[PDB]
Design a binder for these strands. Structure first.
Lengths: 53, 57
DNA sequence: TTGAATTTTGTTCAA
DNA sequence: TTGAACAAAATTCAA
């Protein structure tokens, strides 16, 4: 749940505020590989939803 | 729009393969017989037009 | 988790 | 507008 709020924070920064993973790494004081892994986790828990026509 | 309709269709097919089928941009290029850079551009075109929609929470 | 290695993506250039 | 080439962004691996 600490993990959860963080994946959400990473996701908003990435998809709503157009940040790169590195920008998000610095802004949250964590590694780029951790950003990658959270971004996958956000999509897994459906915090990030992708729908196609 | 008939050249546009071609682009829309090609765009939507690229997006499905990418986001539903988990294909690499390279794989999509093979299947649709187009350059990988063209795929990169089509995927962006699909997001711009709302063919793909990404929502957080 | 992260530092290193590897693979995938986006962009510039010339056409 | 498209594909070639390459720098760099993202992902995977090993620890």
């Amino acid at each position: 749940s600490e993990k959860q709020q963080l994946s959400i924070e990473a996701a908003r920064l990435y998809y709503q505020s157009d940040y790169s993973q590195q920008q998000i790494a610095e802004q949250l004081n964590i590694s780029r590989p951790t950003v990658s892994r959270l971004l996958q986790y956000a999509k897994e828990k459906g915090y990030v939803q992708i729908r196609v026509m």
